[PDB]
Design a protein around this ligand. Sequence first.
Ligand SMILES: O=C(Nc1ncc(Br)s1)NS(=O)(=O)c1ccc(-c2ccon2)s1
Ligand SMILES: O=C(Nc1ncc(Br)s1)NS(=O)(=O)c1ccc(-c2ccon2)s1
Ligand SMILES: O=C(Nc1ncc(Br)s1)NS(=O)(=O)c1ccc(-c2ccon2)s1
Ligand SMILES: O=C(Nc1ncc(Br)s1)NS(=O)(=O)c1ccc(-c2ccon2)s1
Lengths: 317, 319, 317, 318
Amino acid sequence: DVNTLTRFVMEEGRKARGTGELTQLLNSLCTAVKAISSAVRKAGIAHLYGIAGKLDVLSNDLVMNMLKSSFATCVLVSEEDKHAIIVEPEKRGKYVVCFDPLDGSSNIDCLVSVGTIFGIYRKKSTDEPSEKDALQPGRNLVAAGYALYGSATMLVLAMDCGVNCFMLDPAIGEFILVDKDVKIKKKGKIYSLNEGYAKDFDPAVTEYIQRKKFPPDNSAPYGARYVGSMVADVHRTLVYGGIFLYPANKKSPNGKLRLLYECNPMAYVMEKAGGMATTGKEAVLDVIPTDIHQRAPVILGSPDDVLEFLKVYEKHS
Amino acid sequence: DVNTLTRFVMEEGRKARGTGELTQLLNSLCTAVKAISSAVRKAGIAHLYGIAGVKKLDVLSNDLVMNMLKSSFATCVLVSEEDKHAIIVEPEKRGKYVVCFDPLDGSSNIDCLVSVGTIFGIYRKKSTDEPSEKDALQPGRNLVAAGYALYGSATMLVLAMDCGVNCFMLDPAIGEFILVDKDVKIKKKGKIYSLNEGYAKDFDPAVTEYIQRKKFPPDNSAPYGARYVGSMVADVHRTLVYGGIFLYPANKKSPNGKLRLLYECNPMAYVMEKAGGMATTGKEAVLDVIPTDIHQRAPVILGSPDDVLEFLKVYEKHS
Amino acid sequence: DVNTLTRFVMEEGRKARGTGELTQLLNSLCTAVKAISSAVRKAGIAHLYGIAGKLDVLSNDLVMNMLKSSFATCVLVSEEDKHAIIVEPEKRGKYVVCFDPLDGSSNIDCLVSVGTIFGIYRKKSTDEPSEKDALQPGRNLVAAGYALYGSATMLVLAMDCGVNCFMLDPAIGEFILVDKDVKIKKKGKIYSLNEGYAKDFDPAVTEYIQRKKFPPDNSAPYGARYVGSMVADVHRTLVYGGIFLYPANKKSPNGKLRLLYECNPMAYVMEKAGGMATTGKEAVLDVIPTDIHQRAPVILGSPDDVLEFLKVYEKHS
Amino acid sequence: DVNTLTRFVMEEGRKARGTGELTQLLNSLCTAVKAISSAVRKAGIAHLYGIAGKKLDVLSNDLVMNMLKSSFATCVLVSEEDKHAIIVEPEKRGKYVVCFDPLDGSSNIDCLVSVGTIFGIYRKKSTDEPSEKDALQPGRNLVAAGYALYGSATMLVLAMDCGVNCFMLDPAIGEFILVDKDVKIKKKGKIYSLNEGYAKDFDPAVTEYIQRKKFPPDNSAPYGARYVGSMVADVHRTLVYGGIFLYPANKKSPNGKLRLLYECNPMAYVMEKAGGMATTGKEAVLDVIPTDIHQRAPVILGSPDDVLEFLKVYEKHS
Ligand SMILES: O=C(Nc1ncc(Br)s1)NS(=O)(=O)c1ccc(-c2ccon2)s1
Ligand SMILES: O=C(Nc1ncc(Br)s1)NS(=O)(=O)c1ccc(-c2ccon2)s1
Ligand SMILES: O=C(Nc1ncc(Br)s1)NS(=O)(=O)c1ccc(-c2ccon2)s1
Ligand SMILES: O=C(Nc1ncc(Br)s1)NS(=O)(=O)c1ccc(-c2ccon2)s1
């Protein structure tokens, strides 16, 4: 039987006897995602070029405005905004959302895949909402996932019930459930990182990559793929298995990717799908943040691959 | 003044006072590309999943391109990645052009929603013989027009002709390709290199050395960034827009490369050269290779001219 | 604040503290409506005409399948089906839906406006579900309305809270709330019926229409509009006021339109908008049906107009 | 074999060995129609209602005006929306004159009634500097005419010397697909279409003609009645199903109500190319010689047997 994102979430929500607030939040976010997809695919671009005589900004505005008007949120953290946005009292609900509204858009000029990343926390205190309510470890996530605007648009949603993938059908503007309760391959054959920084790699990363090209057990060398857009590389990792790395380098000693709205949501999806996500020293989801924009190293993907990296890492202490 | 692909092509065609056959071919191709784009973006996928109670995209894309080109009355020989032999257009529909195309390049990994694309190269039939597979065995130098549609974050058609390279964005709201970048030229030198480094164990020594220079520059310059989507159209388009170098080179296990000369390497080589870039096998310009088999493979290193020249110096150093 | 059909319904649902089942039904119906709209606008018709080398049945299948899979329905009555459809046990919910999946489609060759009409009842007995569960007077309606596939696609939804109109934005597949709590004009200036059959008119219809064209006082004659598609004519009546008639005559003593999925839903929309809908003898919503396909006369619209018709009607009684 | 509007027109153009200018005009017009369709169907209306925190008839006029200007195929443009003829600037001037109604019927678009775009295309006949007078040609001089109907689906009906062809807009690919070729209207229909609200003002010929449709003297079946009130919708039904459409003069409209240049003439041309008829009562619509670009005309059009029967009634009343 066919299923849609809205109906699936309503069915899980009624099952759990929740109040509906998370459903209202996720439905609003889905509306924003469909609007981002439409603009990213350049619907209406003829009007900008004069037929009748910004994208990261628009995407941020869509997510902010839909989440605010959902009555489900109180604190909103975005890659685009220096400080947390505090929802005004009349529109406040109980959830905190950290999101990247158009990840990868710095290279959208070459039509690279881009995406929207989000993580949802429940506000724990009766204190007035503030930026500090977003300073939770990824372990506290109630839901996370991403929309990938690739060759097609897909929303990947991870909750306690598992990871589910929904294809946007542009003919009807509906997210169709196409992959249920997805689990990542135990071990893959693709590794994904920017080898342009080889001169800056930690010795553990250098050794691990060497194992991928010259395997010690005489297995076949891994293929390499690096789109340079996190959502595209991570989604490929989920679908085909393998490993994605953005480790520390000379320009980024704490990594480059952002803990709150890049690393934690992807770590949560990976773990809910039976994969792993590590900084090298600990699970991404266990890092306790002190800055809503702080960076974190991330190595994620199939469990055997991440475990193999951790073995190399531990060898170098 | 706003411009669309159709209007751009009709105006160039009236300027050149051609008969309209190439315009008819290109318009038919654009219609196929719009239909491929619609399917790649999964319009109607709800019906496959039972909303009311089927082909793979690469098969459907081949059918779309084949049928629109046959019915254009502009073509006589059609070479597709999908078909072992050239398709000969039936007599009542024959025009003067030969088209080699890859209808959905990169589709092997479309399960992960990677960018995919359509690549095409257009020749004029040279012989007065009955049309045959031999009419497709022309060097890339003979191309009349070539380019690609990239189904990425948006859909773009890049079209190269004698007048240069022009980029048209598909507006899905109205099904028109809007001219957005005119007479584009590639950067003289870039800062990105693009190849599958997972197979480093098999690299030719010149490739190994060149990549080492990009990561560990001898002149204290900044190391290049690396990008490899693994879908030729996505990687080549990034090379065009940002500059830099793309490599799918020969090695000991693959002395002729992996990519296909007629409908992958030649069209991209032609786009690159019309944009002021370069495209080499290592031994010669891709566009100068004279094919003997419509599916033969060719190595390709292409992109910003300084980057390709630097690669060629390393290649020559290793003989 | 922007509002969508889904958000509007969930909000009314949490206000009313319902279980969510009616929201699940309405979300499912909206998905079917978007899919009908897409097919009605001929998305994909190029494939039927050979680019790569029924509509009423499809519309019925979309509504049937989306409602069955909603888990909110137990008995489904459609203009397209001779008998009531009984939902299989594992998918049964508490609601009964009567619908016309593509009203007006008999003339769709000329691209006339078409529409989907629906009325939703609560199943009243604990008996095994059967056709009798749909034999409720329109007074028992929980929700009713229609989708108009006209120059744009609009969903008009009537419930206890009133009548609200939602415009389908095809770029994102969301029904946008554009007219809230709408009320019909007290008196209009348009009459709508097929005057070609004047020779069969009941004498009261003949006189009433004659008064619209040749007013006895010095008022302006009414304009005439008759699309011949019920959803188009009723929606114009709602928007501009006036009167719509498909009355009884000697050859058709029960009228021609169908009570369960044409007359009752429109009568309910009209009454919730402050309009009226009569058979001539009684309110449409008070007719107790004995046949799921039974016909009913209907005269509906602005109350002053319907009351004036009833004055002429009794005069010939 | 599948066929599209662009491909059909290029093929007819190469057959006739024209210069391509009319094709350039028609392709530009079709681009405008697709953009009007997108806006009429309310794509993007969520942004207008604040999802991120022109009137349709004005936008439609701007789309057609701008695409026709930039086509280099036109010199004088007459629109329902513009008091005076628009003169194309010298560097963009081509040889054709276009009269159009960019969004016919939009006064009631509040009720989502079908709306449409109507157009008629002339060759500029005079060598004078382009002016409003270049649009004052009788409909007989039309080179091409037709309409887009934004109804349950979007359809473009194009009439030329080769006949009338109907193209369905496939929104999935933004392409007009040829679905009805060389269309001909039924010799006689069973539907009449007019606003009977003006019955008190009808001239005796119309009153009698309508009486014949309801109470046939030969005891045949009465005609059904349909009146959307949007000309493109009513005329297209007449083309597809046959029958007759009337908008005669009345007291509010003593010279008729519909506009000669960009409503009556294009529809009259489509009807005649489809084997139908279009009369003012006194003469063929296409034979009226206009003096004012916004002048009105009575019109009775449709199946030839139906219009001929009307004209017989008209003659009887002198
Ligand atoms: O939505 C509701 N209740 C409702 N009542 C009526 C309607 Br209709 S939906 N509750 S909820 O908290 O928002 C929620 C949504 C999803 C949840 C989930 C997913 C996996 O595990 N739990 S929990
Ligand atoms: O299209 C025509 N003639 C026409 N007549 C009327 C119309 Br309308 S189009 N000829 S052509 O050969 O097909 C051609 C198309 C594009 C060309 C080109 C691009 C760059 O440099 N030359 S040449
Ligand atoms: O939807 C719910 N409950 C929910 N809880 C959480 C979420 Br999220 S939805 N209940 S309901 O019965 O389906 C219903 C829907 C609309 C209703 C209505 C409209 C006007 O007057 N009443 S009543
Ligand atoms: O388009 C051309 N020539 C071309 N050459 C190459 C290309 Br490609 S198009 N000429 S034309 O005048 O514009 C014209 C268009 C349609 C016409 C017609 C329809 C019915 O009867 N005549 S005549």
